[PDB]
Ligand binder design. Structure first.
Ligand SMILES: O=C(Nc1ccc(Cl)cc1)Nc1ccc(Cl)c(Cl)c1
Ligand SMILES: O=C(Nc1ccc(Cl)cc1)Nc1ccc(Cl)c(Cl)c1
Ligand SMILES: O=C(Nc1ccc(Cl)cc1)Nc1ccc(Cl)c(Cl)c1
Ligand SMILES: O=C(Nc1ccc(Cl)cc1)Nc1ccc(Cl)c(Cl)c1
Lengths: 125, 126, 125, 125
């Protein structure tokens, strides 16, 4: 692979809690390229959460996470973050970052050829 | 005695085009929907608004000169607000301050914020 | 009410993670005086965690936290910090700082007349 | 290439004042590896100030700073701090942090391949 994505920072929190995930990229990195966050809960397909792309770090969000989750990036560290607030039990899933050779963010996981390892996030009621 | 205390971290010297993350950790009677504003001040210059975050939905606002380069976010449970800087320029050199007030509305005037961080130096070499 | 201690910095940490607590002193402060750190889990008495005192900022630690926790102090801010690393569930507890009119760090809570209000630290695994 | 360190927080202080420097590590970090602090005044070569290393986080100090300066570590944030107290004008210098692929602390700058950018510190009369 041209690029390797290493994820950090999940765990188990109570409803209303916060977590921050990181996705550190190494290899032939290019920070304007799209980084997507996707999650997969038990029994479900990979659902798009949000993405970041472009020379100006523009973000886009799924309806179910807007306002609560925030995506950012540190260019010099080649790292993209997913800040999660007001967490809900329904947010429980394995979270993945993924990237592709385009600035454009897509909702389809299938157009991202490069995947991080996944991080479990679990939210108690 | 203040009702809230702001403790700033991060900063330093980087090259033009570099990146930094600044942190502003709030303690005491904290209420995370209240506005947190970032201001900067370079030696011999007036204070100026950088950007801010506020509201239940974490709405952000920025000065024109930093839009597309700086991003503000918050971590409610750590009661901490971050200012992510990318594509840094010599022009961005200054002490950076966070500030807060008992209102969700982000104001661009420093006068309306009664509570201040201690500042952190950011130097961007030419 | 000769010196008062305001704590900061508690909360939920994931197993293996880190947290810094703060204890700020106000009033007729003497930074060479001993600041003790103690914790209490439900169903146990306040047990000594560690402490700092003297002009040289000498420290001492309970066996179970040595290597993992560091105490330090900032004289101009009249603040003492508890840096905690490699946190595990056994560390979950309400954590207190305390002081006394003496440079000697005592392991007994009874000889400290000044207490901070305490903060909860919860670790899940 | 493998780890970067970013230093924070220089500045002016009065004699008798305190200051806290940070050294944030990023990349393929290993937190028990040795991080040394050095200082250099108007061209004199970097003299050792202190270091921290090992699983149990052991600290070592130069004679000229012991007691007054303290080093600690936050493993979660891959950051090392140097807290400075009772500062005096002879402490005026550029301070650096450095790291190496070994737990062992050494007093020689040479054996640390990785260098922070340096922070100025100035202490007045
Ligand atoms: O590098 C990246 N994305 C990326 C995005 C944000 C940050 Cl901070 C860092 C890296 N993508 C990339 C690079 C090369 C190829 Cl071939 C492909 Cl297919 C993708
Ligand atoms: O608490 C805050 N702001 C704040 C904003 C964001 C975060 Cl993550 C955390 C805290 N302000 C506040 C609170 C009380 C008073 Cl009196 C005043 Cl005057 C201001
Ligand atoms: O001041 C302190 N402790 C203290 C410790 C560390 C720092 Cl950084 C700052 C302050 N104790 C004190 C002071 C006065 C009295 Cl009467 C008594 Cl009874 C205790
Ligand atoms: O990681 C480190 N040091 C370090 C020290 C303190 C903390 Cl909190 C975190 C990290 N060194 C390192 C790591 C890799 C390489 Cl190749 C080299 Cl050459 C050095």
């Amino acid at each position: 692979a041209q690029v390797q994505l290493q994820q950090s920072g999940g765990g188990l929190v109570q409803a209303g809690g916060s977590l921050r995930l990181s996705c550190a990229a190494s290899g032939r990195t290019h920070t304007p390229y799209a980084m997507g966050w996707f999650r997969q809960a038990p029994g479900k397909e990979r659902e798009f959460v949000g993405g970041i792309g472009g020379v100006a770090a523009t973000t886009t969000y799924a309806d179910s996470v807007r306002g609560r989750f925030t995506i950012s990036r540190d260019d010099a560290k080649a790292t993209v973050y997913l800040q999660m607030n007001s967490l809900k039990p329904e947010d429980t899933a394995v979270y993945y970052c993924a990237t592709r050779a385009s600035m454009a963010v897509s909702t389809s996981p299938r157009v991202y050829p490069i995947w991080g390892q996944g991080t479990q996030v679990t939210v108690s009621s």
